Amino acid sequence: ILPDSVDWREKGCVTEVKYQGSCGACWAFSAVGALEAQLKLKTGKLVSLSAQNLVDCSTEKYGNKGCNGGFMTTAFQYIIDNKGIDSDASYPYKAMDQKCQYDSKYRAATCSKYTELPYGREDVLKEAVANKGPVSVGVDARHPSFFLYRSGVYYEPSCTQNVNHGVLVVGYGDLNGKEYWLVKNSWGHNFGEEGYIRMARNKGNHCGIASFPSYPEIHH
Amino acid sequence: ILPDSVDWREKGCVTEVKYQGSCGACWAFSAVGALEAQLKLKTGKLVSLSAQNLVDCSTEKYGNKGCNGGFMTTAFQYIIDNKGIDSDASYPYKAMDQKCQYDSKYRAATCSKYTELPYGREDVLKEAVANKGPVSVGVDARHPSFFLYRSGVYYEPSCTQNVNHGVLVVGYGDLNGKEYWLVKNSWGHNFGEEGYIRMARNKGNHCGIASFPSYPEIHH
Ligand SMILES: CS(=O)(=O)N1CCN(c2ccc3nncn3n2)CC1
Ligand SMILES: CS(=O)(=O)N1CCN(c2ccc3nncn3n2)CC1
Numbered sequence: 001i002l003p004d005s006v007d008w009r010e011k012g013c014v015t016e017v018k019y020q021g022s023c024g025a026c027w028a029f030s031a032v033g034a035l036e037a038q039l040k041l042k043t044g045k046l047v048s049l050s051a052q053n054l055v056d057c058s059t060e061k062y063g064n065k066g067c068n069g070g071f072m073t074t075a076f077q078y079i080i081d082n083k084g085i086d087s088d089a090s091y092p093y094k095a096m097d098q099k100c101q102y103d104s105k106y107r108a109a110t111c112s113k114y115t116e117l118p119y120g121r122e123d124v125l126k127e128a129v130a131n132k133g134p135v136s137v138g139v140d141a142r143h144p145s146f147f148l149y150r151s152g153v154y155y156e157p158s159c160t161q162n163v164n165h166g167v168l169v170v171g172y173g174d175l176n177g178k179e180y181w182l183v184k185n186s187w188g189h190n191f192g193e194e195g196y197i198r199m200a201r202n203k204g205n206h207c208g209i210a211s212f213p214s215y216p217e218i219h220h
Numbered sequence: 221i222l223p224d225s226v227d228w229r230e231k232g233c234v235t236e237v238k239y240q241g242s243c244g245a246c247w248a249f250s251a252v253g254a255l256e257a258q259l260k261l262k263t264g265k266l267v268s269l270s271a272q273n274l275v276d277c278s279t280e281k282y283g284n285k286g287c288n289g290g291f292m293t294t295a296f297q298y299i300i301d302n303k304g305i306d307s308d309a310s311y312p313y314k315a316m317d318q319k320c321q322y323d324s325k326y327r328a329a330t331c332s333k334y335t336e337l338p339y340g341r342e343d344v345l346k347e348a349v350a351n352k353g354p355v356s357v358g359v360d361a362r363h364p365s366f367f368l369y370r371s372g373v374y375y376e377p378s379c380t381q382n383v384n385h386g387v388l389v390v391g392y393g394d395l396n397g398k399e400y401w402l403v404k405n406s407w408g409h410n411f412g413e414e415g416y417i418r419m420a421r422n423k424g425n426h427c428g429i430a431s432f433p434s435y436p437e438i439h440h
Binding site for chain 1: 280281282283293294297300301333334336338339340380381382383425428431
């Protein structure tokens, strides 16, 4: 029986909201956020990981295009292949494409595997967020209403399953009879509810939130 | 220990080569080809499955755009969710977007699940082709050499891991020192080696062939 609500911020597994600026690196922020939680679960330490390291290093071999987009799964595979990712403090975010500057001296996490959830299954996504941790997802963030979200549970009749923006599901619940996913964005604290958006849950895979979920793991 | 060469056509698990014509339905052909093999393994029948059913019915809610492209994995999820796919004979291919005409009375196959292989791992792809069946993959077909291919092992110096064309790996082997993946295309029998292309194997994930591999399975 799954909990009726989850919020991984209550377990110290979520870092401060980040600001991606004019660089389309949401995929990199989504991927580091999922791995940050697993790092906390394994080591007890909450550490922001380097989205810039993914932008600069998880590049064309990984199907990624830096500030012009990419994939959370292939970011995970780069972390596996590279045998590490640097901390954000060591390898800070510049919102630009740069030369690869990875250095194992500054490694703050590893990754051993990743899992992709089945397409559109919000029950399976609920299980994963309850039992595994925060889950990387894509959402359709194209609609003017998304940018203007301030409160409540986001439901946009014009939303599609054509996803364009990587984000992080850190929880779920029910507000005033509306089920929601708790989503951490990378547009700074100004966006939404201190950087978060509650997005409609069990409303037909609204905005594609359960289309392409993935999460990493760190083994012994 | 894996076999040095595999060809699923010798196992009776590969249908005749199809012709997509002016419709970008490669994803749909790739998906039905992978499931046709599993249907043969479960039932003993080799049956062409309806790519048109996927074009018409695995649409916006699956992130697909019919003749303008789509995903093999979300095609598999459509078949799971729909509890079926029709035969090609009952629901033939017209190389255009149509209204959904699925009818369960023409069901030829089901799907219980699908598996996405880890990114870029040609050894894992080899294991899957040897032990599970033909595998749906994407390749970078954005080079004139792919269109002009006639025979032998295809290697394109300009190839990338930015994949755009869904195809089916039906085997692997080597041509006098040159390892290859045996790929079934959907550009008719005049393409390549009577519909097939042998693509370079163990050459750094050449043309992204091991970027995004998936295969479906049928209950039992
Ligand atoms: C950057 S994004 O968050 O908008 N989004 C783009 C789509 N991505 C896909 C696409 C097909 C697919 N099949 N399996 C996993 N995916 N993931 C996920 C990342
Ligand atoms: C139509 S295609 O054959 O060129 N190709 C497009 C890319 N697709 C992706 C994309 C991201 C992704 N992340 N994980 C799994 N995939 N699959 C697979 C299908």
